[PDB]
Design a protein around this motif. Sequence first.
Motif, PDB file in Angstrom:
ATOM      1  N   UNK A  29       0.789  -1.233   0.000  1.00  0.00           N
ATOM      2  CA  UNK A  29       0.000   0.000   0.000  1.00  0.00           C
ATOM      3  C   UNK A  29       0.819   1.282   0.000  1.00  0.00           C
ATOM      4  N   UNK A  30       1.905   1.317  -0.760  1.00  0.00           N
ATOM      5  CA  UNK A  30       2.568   2.579  -1.022  1.00  0.00           C
ATOM      6  C   UNK A  30       1.589   3.564  -1.680  1.00  0.00           C
ATOM      7  N   UNK A  31       1.642   4.815  -1.258  1.00  0.00           N
ATOM      8  CA  UNK A  31       0.806   5.864  -1.873  1.00  0.00           C
ATOM      9  C   UNK A  31       1.533   7.207  -1.901  1.00  0.00           C
ATOM     10  N   UNK A  32       1.444   7.873  -3.041  1.00  0.00           N
ATOM     11  CA  UNK A  32       2.146   9.110  -3.282  1.00  0.00           C
ATOM     12  C   UNK A  32       1.148  10.173  -3.743  1.00  0.00           C
ATOM     13  N   UNK A  53       4.258   4.225   4.312  1.00  0.00           N
ATOM     14  CA  UNK A  53       4.487   4.330   2.876  1.00  0.00           C
ATOM     15  C   UNK A  53       3.500   5.172   2.111  1.00  0.00           C
ATOM     16  N   UNK A  93       1.798   9.031   1.729  1.00  0.00           N
ATOM     17  CA  UNK A  93       1.886  10.434   2.105  1.00  0.00           C
ATOM     18  C   UNK A  93       0.555  10.901   2.710  1.00  0.00           C
ATOM     19  N   UNK A 147      -1.340   8.192  -6.809  1.00  0.00           N
ATOM     20  CA  UNK A 147      -0.717   6.997  -7.359  1.00  0.00           C
ATOM     21  C   UNK A 147      -0.279   6.013  -6.314  1.00  0.00           C
TER      22      UNK A 147
END
Lengths: 8, 198
Positions: free
Chosen positions: A4-7, B27, B29, B48
């Motif tokens: 669950x990386x989110x940017x 992980x 933001x 994203x």
Amino acid sequence: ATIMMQRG
Amino acid sequence: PQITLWKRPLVTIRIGGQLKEALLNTGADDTVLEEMNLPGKWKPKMIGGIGGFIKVRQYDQIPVEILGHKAIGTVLVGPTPVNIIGRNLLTQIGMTLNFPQITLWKRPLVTIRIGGQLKEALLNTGADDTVLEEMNLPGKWKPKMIGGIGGFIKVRQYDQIPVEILGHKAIGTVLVGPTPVNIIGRNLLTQIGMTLNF
């Protein structure tokens, strides 16, 4: 297998 | 209080008057919740993840109670697979990573040593597994699919790969594929003794 990386 | 990472760091939150389960995610933001109604005006936004981009509704200055701590901030609503509490709210509740202490004001990026290379990677409590950008590692591997915010990517699974993270030795499964960011997941975070604390 959940990545669950989110940017913003 | 101290949360270890052998399991997903899921907690109950309270938002818009309702209880929900959400993942404490170093992980991310931002905070992203599954489809729901929230009061007030919103603006469309795009974000994203590991499988690409999704459209979300951005609600500003929303009260959220997490582990008995009050945050007030931006909550995104959309087709995320899992409710996730990102750094925007983790900072408000005073959460840190510990093993030394790492604050969450910025992305928790650190150097890792793997397969004879030094790389920058994201300490990610919202990842089960460790996923590194494409590299030609020696050894036997098998194909795997891994998912996240915008869907799935195909990766190569290598087993029993020695890694070193912040001077700590680990050895485990590493997935290799077209991830936008190198990710250190819980499989290795538990090995180097990392916890969440507040």
